[PDB]
Amino acid sequence: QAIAKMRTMIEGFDDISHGGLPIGRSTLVSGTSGTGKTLFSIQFLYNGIIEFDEPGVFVTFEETPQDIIKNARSFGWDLAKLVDEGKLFILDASPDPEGQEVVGGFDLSALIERINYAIQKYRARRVSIDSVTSVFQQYDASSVVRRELFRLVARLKQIGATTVMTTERIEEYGPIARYGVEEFVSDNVVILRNVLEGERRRRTLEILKLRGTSHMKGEYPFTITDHGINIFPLGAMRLTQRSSNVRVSSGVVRLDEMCGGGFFKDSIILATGATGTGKTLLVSRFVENACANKERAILFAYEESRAQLLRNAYSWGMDFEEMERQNLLKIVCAYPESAGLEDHLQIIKSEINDFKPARIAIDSLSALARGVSNNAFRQFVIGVTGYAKQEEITGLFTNTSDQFMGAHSITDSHIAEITDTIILLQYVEIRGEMSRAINVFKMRGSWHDKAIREFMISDKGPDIKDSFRNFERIISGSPTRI
Amino acid sequence: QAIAKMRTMIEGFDDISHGGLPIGRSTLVSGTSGTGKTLFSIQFLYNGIIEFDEPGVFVTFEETPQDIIKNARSFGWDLAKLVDEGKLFILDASPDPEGQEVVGGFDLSALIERINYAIQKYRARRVSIDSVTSVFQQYDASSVVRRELFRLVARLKQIGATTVMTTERIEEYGPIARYGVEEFVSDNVVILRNVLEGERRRRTLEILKLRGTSHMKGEYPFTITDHGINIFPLGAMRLTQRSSNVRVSSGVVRLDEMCGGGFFKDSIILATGATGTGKTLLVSRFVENACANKERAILFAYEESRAQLLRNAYSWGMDFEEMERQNLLKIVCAYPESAGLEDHLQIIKSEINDFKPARIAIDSLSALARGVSNNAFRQFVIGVTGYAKQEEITGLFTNTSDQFMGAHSITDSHIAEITDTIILLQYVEIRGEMSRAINVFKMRGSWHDKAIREFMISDKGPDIKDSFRNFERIISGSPTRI
Amino acid sequence: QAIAKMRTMIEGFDDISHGGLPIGRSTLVSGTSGTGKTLFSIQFLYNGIIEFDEPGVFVTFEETPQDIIKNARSFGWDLAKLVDEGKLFILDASPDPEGQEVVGGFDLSALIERINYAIQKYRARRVSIDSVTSVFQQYDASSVVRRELFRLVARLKQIGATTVMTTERIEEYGPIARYGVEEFVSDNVVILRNVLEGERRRRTLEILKLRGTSHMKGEYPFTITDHGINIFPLGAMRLTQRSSNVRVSSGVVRLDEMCGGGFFKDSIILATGATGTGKTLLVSRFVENACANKERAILFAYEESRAQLLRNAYSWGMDFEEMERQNLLKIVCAYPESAGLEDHLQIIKSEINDFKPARIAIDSLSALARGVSNNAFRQFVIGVTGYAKQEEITGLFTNTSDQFMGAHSITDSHIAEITDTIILLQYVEIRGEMSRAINVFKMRGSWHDKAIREFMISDKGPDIKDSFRNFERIISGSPTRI
Ligand SMILES: Nc1ncnc2c1ncn2[C@@H]1O[C@H](COP(=O)(O)OP(=O)(O)OP(=O)(O)O)[C@@H](O)[C@H]1O
Ligand SMILES: Nc1ncnc2c1ncn2[C@@H]1O[C@H](COP(=O)(O)OP(=O)(O)OP(=O)(O)O)[C@@H](O)[C@H]1O
Ligand SMILES: Nc1ncnc2c1ncn2[C@@H]1O[C@H](COP(=O)(O)OP(=O)(O)OP(=O)(O)O)[C@@H](O)[C@H]1O
Ligand SMILES: Nc1ncnc2c1ncn2[C@@H]1O[C@H](COP(=O)(O)OP(=O)(O)O)[C@@H](O)[C@H]1O
Ligand SMILES: Nc1ncnc2c1ncn2[C@@H]1O[C@H](COP(=O)(O)OP(=O)(O)O)[C@@H](O)[C@H]1O
Ligand SMILES: Nc1ncnc2c1ncn2[C@@H]1O[C@H](COP(=O)(O)OP(=O)(O)O)[C@@H](O)[C@H]1O
Ligand SMILES: [Mg+2]
Ligand SMILES: [Mg+2]
Numbered sequence A, B, C: 001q002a003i004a005k006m007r008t009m010i011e012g013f014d015d016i017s018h019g020g021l022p023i024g025r026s027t028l029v030s031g032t033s034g035t036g037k038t039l040f041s042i043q044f045l046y047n048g049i050i051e052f053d054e055p056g057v058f059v060t061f062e063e064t065p066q067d068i069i070k071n072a073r074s075f076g077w078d079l080a081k082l083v084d085e086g087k088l089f090i091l092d093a094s095p096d097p098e099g100q101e102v103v104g105g106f107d108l109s110a111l112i113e114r115i116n117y118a119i120q121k122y123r124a125r126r127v128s129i130d131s132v133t134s135v136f137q138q139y140d141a142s143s144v145v146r147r148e149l150f151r152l153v154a155r156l157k158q159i160g161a162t163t164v165m166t167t168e169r170i171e172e173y174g175p176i177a178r179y180g181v182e183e184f185v186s187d188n189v190v191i192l193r194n195v196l197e198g199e200r201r202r203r204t205l206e207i208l209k210l211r212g213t214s215h216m217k218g219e220y221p222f223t224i225t226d227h228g229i230n231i232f233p234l235g236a237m238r239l240t241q242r243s244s245n246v247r248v249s250s251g252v253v254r255l256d257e258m259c260g261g262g263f264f265k266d267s268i269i270l271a272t273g274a275t276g277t278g279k280t281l282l283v284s285r286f287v288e289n290a291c292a293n294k295e296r297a298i299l300f301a302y303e304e305s306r307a308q309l310l311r312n313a314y315s316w317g318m319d320f321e322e323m324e325r326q327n328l329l330k331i332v333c334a335y336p337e338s339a340g341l342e343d344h345l346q347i348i349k350s351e352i353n354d355f356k357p358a359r360i361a362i363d364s365l366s367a368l369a370r371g372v373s374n375n376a377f378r379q380f381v382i383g384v385t386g387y388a389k390q391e392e393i394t395g396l397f398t399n400t401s402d403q404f405m406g407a408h409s410i411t412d413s414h415i416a417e418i419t420d421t422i423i424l425l426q427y428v429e430i431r432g433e434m435s436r437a438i439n440v441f442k443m444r445g446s447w448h449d450k451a452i453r454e455f456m457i458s459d460k461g462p463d464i465k466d467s468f469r470n471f472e473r474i475i476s477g478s479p480t481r482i
């Protein structure tokens, strides 16, 4: 029949690969130094032993087994334990650090026989090699490498164990492997990258090909945590979601009225407008209302410290510290520069999975956009939006405009298109003095107030008034009286 | 007379090539690892045997016949069956995986004689080689490769069988082949690419040349499905279409009136405007009307999940689930990121060919533009537009504006130029409050209402009113009363 | 257990590295000529001896010990003293400057044994090598280098001392090391760069990898001072800050009133507007008020010399020279071109740490933006903003607009988003003549006056009037009377 696959149990990878790696065949994993190729290899064998009770063999040329164990330990697991139990075997084929003699092609034959023995001895199902170039570096000829890799691949295929071979690159977008032949010999090729753009590094995983089967294509970003490799295949995200007719309060009565009876629990709300329009007040009231009803909520802060958030909240009549004491409100403060954009996604998911909030709020999306491309930014927002909706978490987001009394409160980001409810705030010029205006622009699941209303901010929170009747051109930031 | 060609029966390819490959000559197919060169080769021989009852020979150097069969099976056909029947022959010229000796140029002579024998034995008409570099890699000299390929090409020409040779590249836009001679020796050259741009891969096929004959030029995108290679030569699409005078209802009476008695069945309708203007309502009513008249329709959703579409439809009085139960309405939900733009085209065609809809609708074209270049986007839209018109399927499309009460509802995409009927929606400022406006901008086949009218959205669907008499500058988003 | 690290006591480095270098392992430090690789090496051993009383070994191939001592002295410390005391040892393995014979691989074995001896003799904990290529340059083979470095790394690992090896590059964004193998052999890789962009050099440090542990990623800028290497890991900066409810006067009564009772002591104030709106007056009054209350303040001047600042201050009734005499006011004048942007940050911190000001003011941020990218500029501003708030220093900043009576006083820089209080100044056209207007746009911790007021400048300082009642479109720069 068709080719079967073996699950790696690596988050994201198994979805990108459509079920894991081809069984009874090798896969070649490449990349430049620092991409964590050896982490993939260890995590693969590790998960096999733990999850499927499948023994495996790790072949090492470049590292003493002592360091392999010591390094793996940083991810919360003990490989030495698995070795003692007869589940994991490490085949030491490293060169002598005190002086190593030159060898010929017999080295490959000797290697394979030792691997075969180890596989049979431990009935290994999963095998990996830290560096195939350990036996190619011995010579310059690329034609020889083609043949030598062919022999290694075909021989492990004879055995039938699933194999993960590791090779290496100099360039990110250059040749897949050093000799320019290896990627043609291998039937299954995966490349890891650690691309430097601007001043930042972004890790990605790609499956170049899998002969005889299917997979997702393109570069899929990933990070490395204390649990090992975590891949974020946004294209694998589903639109299968549970809708609701449940309403929740924003903490602001006139706003709830404008939204036709509050906001939907499963909706995503985006508040936009110029800095100083009180977006942080709407956020504070949102999380406060959740706490008022004994619901858990998380605020992700980027522009203001906790000490300042507490002060500003008190000036608006909100006791943030009390909400923390009751374990209802969490404050998560971090600079955009403290983590990669993909790490912010992981942080948000981690805090949510741990605290199990009913609602979350983001202090500023425009802050996160600060250090990234438009593509990186929109993918982040989509990922968060999807997750929050799939988890049925009420979400409140903000996006700051740079138009100082210029109205025209629109986004180059275009997040409103994927968001449910849009709240627009702006400054206006009235009788020679500045004021503020609020409008509910849209709401997918309901009727909403179309009026453009004046509002002010007091020590009791927001103060919403009636519409600007007999004015024109409010949307320009400079209304005319008529 | 003139050079005759042999049809490959590969979709798109035979149109690009103007009738297939030159008969009695070789064609050299190149490309980087992962381009599926071996798929073209197998599909070529396979179709010959099935469609024209033409036996063929597959020469393998890099892969065991067992894997060739096993891999081919993923595309829904059994090559082993064809081998047993004496239709397909695989010539195994692979190196010994357990140790291979060095050989000279006699290897090429021996190869050709075995190929000649196999061709005569099975009366093969179609022959292919998986890797010509299998006998070039043996040495570094490029001058030798020129001669060695010349010998192979000329010898197979003596036989008269049509040949598809495969070679390989390192770079996408670099040399056609490794030694920089092969593309001059071969008289017919085809290059496959798997170009990485941004984070995504895009497959293309190009015919570089065919000596003595004609072909289409440039890169033509393609994808790979469970049926093998599927090429999309948009430039080969025809303007020969059947026009009609049949009208269909949009589900909205006042809109049908503005269009002069409904929309034409063979027309393409584009609705544009800012988010929240109710474009999703017009789409829902469009497919609903088709179902009301017992016509099949497909909705392609990108921005909202099925669960949410059902909720929003119910809030507007439309029972989507009932229309699904009667097998009239289909909901196809996918993220733009879940597939390549060219795959979305294939998905749309597949669903249409299967369900045979009278009408289709696209939830958002701007969503599909999100992750692609302007060139990739416009080609997609043209391809869909052409197909839908050729198939006489009523089509409804949308394009979201980013102008929040800014009117000026125009597209940087310029899809209106190829579309028949244009509907414009916008937000306006009236008496200090927001409202909506609708206008039929054009309709190629009819008279239409030129008025700019106010409208609202209720639980019964759209509510269209009369024109904004005694107002000026409506089109700016900020009308003045006079 | 997990891998332990050794603190280098190098500012910034220990935070980027999450605790310093892995213990009992080597780290490879690379970079092009002029990156100061030898400074890192010396500073590392130096700090070990001084701070932790840890003896060390410096291995030299390229420089006579006499020059190593002489060069180190420029940073305020005497290595010769440490040698005499038996704390520091320099191993001289340099070639004979009067003629050097060719040697083989025995040179590496001899080297290591001498290093081992020196380590044991002085009980060294910290070891470093100035140039590993000193024994690789002897031959061209890259395969040999792989092995030779492996031997050196593994051998020093046997000893257990923490090692800092130095290698070299030709290109900034090219291969990590000359032979393209070294970065794979080493388990811990750090790269220094001195990147030339435009006409300026910018130094950065990056940790490419640390096997078995964690670190911050990406390029982190640094400078070199008379105290050695000083790294500025902005991403490691904290949002943990102490808020306050203390108010301070700006020196301008009507402005203090508009801000609701003065400005907060812990706040950052940004004044924006066209050139000539009197931003330098607000700055002068700010520092003057601090002095009036016997508080120390520093003015950082970029656009005007001290002599001119004194003249302009006297014309506005402010005796700057007297404030200097009392050691309350400091004037720091420098051109933006006189130092790197990162050096301006270091200068600001240095002057603050020395003088212990209650308040600081920046004459022009737009001046500093003049010669730098938007990314370099915003990181600078964030760094200063963070530092000033963490140190509880009242900060006043300015940003000049290029709109001559065009109002629209907005910033492409978007510094207002991270700043607390925003003051906007603009020119307006009134009755055929130019005038000025002032508005408090926002204040995070308080109520503020929303009015747009007229103002003038006299010899007594600023003169603020009442609001522009019965005017419209003030924000455009061209108000209309109505
Ligand atoms: N606890 C951790 N948390 C986060 N990142 C970690 C942690 N522990 C290790 N890392 C990261 O894991 C990376 C994986 O190293 P790995 O050896 O697998 O990369 P590699 O591509 O194989 O490198 P090499 O070419 O040297 O073999 C390390 O470089 C380090 O950046
Ligand atoms: N069922 C399938 N659906 C979609 N794609 C598939 C399916 N089965 C296989 N593929 C794709 O078909 C591609 C064709 O592989 P093929 O060997 O022809 O490429 P190639 O250029 O010849 O590769 P190579 O250089 O290794 O020989 C595979 O890499 C895989 O991405
Ligand atoms: N007092 C000082 N103040 C500022 N910079 C200084 C001072 N003294 C030295 N420098 C800088 O320190 C740099 C460090 O030189 P160093 O040898 O460490 O660089 P390097 O990368 O190792 O150079 P090389 O490749 O020659 O060995 C010098 O090039 C010089 O620019
Ligand atoms: N006690 C108060 N009384 C009146 N207005 C206040 C008070 N405290 C703060 N403000 C208002 O709050 C605004 C800050 O709102 P905020 O939500 O932080 O704006 P942003 O959109 O940037 O997030 C200030 O500009 C000021 O107008
Ligand atoms: N029951 C309702 N009654 C009144 N208005 C509604 C109702 N349900 C939804 N709406 C309106 O429908 C709008 C959404 O229209 P939609 O077609 O989804 O906009 P879009 O152009 O983005 O696709 C909301 O902004 C709201 O004005
Ligand atoms: N004695 C004075 N009397 C009146 N106006 C003065 C006097 N001295 C200077 N000015 C005003 O001060 C302005 C300069 O203000 P300044 O703070 O230097 O502007 P900038 O925003 O560039 O920093 C001059 O354009 C002038 O209008
Ligand atoms: Mg490794
Ligand atoms: Mg804010």
Ligand SMILES: [Mg+2]
Pocket (backbone or CB within 6 Å): B037, B038, B039, B130
């Ligand atoms: Mg192939």
Ligand SMILES: [Mg+2]
Pocket (backbone or CB within 6 Å): B279, B280, B303
């Ligand atoms: Mg929509």
Ligand SMILES: [Mg+2]
Pocket (backbone or CB within 6 Å): C037, C038, C039, C130
């Ligand atoms: Mg040096």
Ligand SMILES: [Mg+2]
Pocket (backbone or CB within 6 Å): C279, C280, C303
């Ligand atoms: Mg000035």
